[PDB]
């Protein structure tokens, strides 16, 4: 003579949602460092990310030309004129360390001690004084 | 830890670049970070 249990939440969950959303889904996370998100979704979202990046770059008032302006596909071309260094991204964030300066007529190129320049770039970016000009 | 780490044939001579490197935080003051977003 036990009355029938309704369990409106669990019933509505098991009615059409054939999964375990209304429960702790951190089994593979609390005892394993698995990838939470952005597993393969980045593949299709890369086009929209690049579009948004280009839109934000165009919207942001860039500095003068100064023979250092460059624009191409793929990402934001920092500078390619002559021997200028190249870089790209990865409010709005500001990434770095995508390429480097170019030279020729060796004497054997410079080694990775250039991190000093990268350290200064990161410090000046996190200072947020004027990223484009410096 | 055997294949490679920093640089094999990373010869001085033009390391002189170092020499000038010793100009640059000086040509211009490093900005404070303290932000690991």
């Amino acid at each position: 003579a036990r009355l029938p249990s309704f369990a409106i939440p669990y019933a509505i969950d098991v009615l059409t949602t054939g999964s375990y959303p209304r429960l702790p889904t951190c089994i593979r996370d609390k005892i394993i460092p698995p990838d939470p998100i952005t597993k393969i979704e980045k593949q299709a979202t890369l086009h929209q990310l690049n579009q948004i990046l280009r839109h934000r770059l165009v919207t942001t008032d860039l500095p003068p030309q100064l023979a250092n302006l460059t624009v191409a596909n793929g990402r934001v071309k920092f500078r390619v004129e002559g021997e200028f260094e190249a870089t790209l991204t990865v409010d709005v964030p500001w990434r770095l360390l995508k390429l480097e300066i170019l030279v020729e007529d060796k004497e054997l190129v410079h080694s990775m001690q250039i991190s000093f320049i990268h350290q200064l770039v990161q410090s000046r970016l996190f200072a947020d004084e004027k990223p484009l000009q410096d | 830890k055997a294949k490679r780490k920093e640089e094999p044939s990373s010869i001085f001579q033009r390391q002189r670049v170092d020499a000038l490197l010793l100009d640059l935080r000086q040509k211009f003051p490093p900005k404070f970070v303290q932000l690991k977003p």
């Binding site: 000093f116 | 640089e7 690991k36």
Partner: peptide
């Protein structure tokens, strides 16, 4: 690397290079 990247201090120069292989 990720971690916290709070390596402030100063220096930001040195060299971090190696090629000692010519009787010198």
């Amino acid at each position: 690397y990720y971690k916290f990247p709070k390596k402030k201090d100063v220096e930001f120069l040195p060299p971090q290079l190696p090629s000692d292989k010519f009787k010198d």
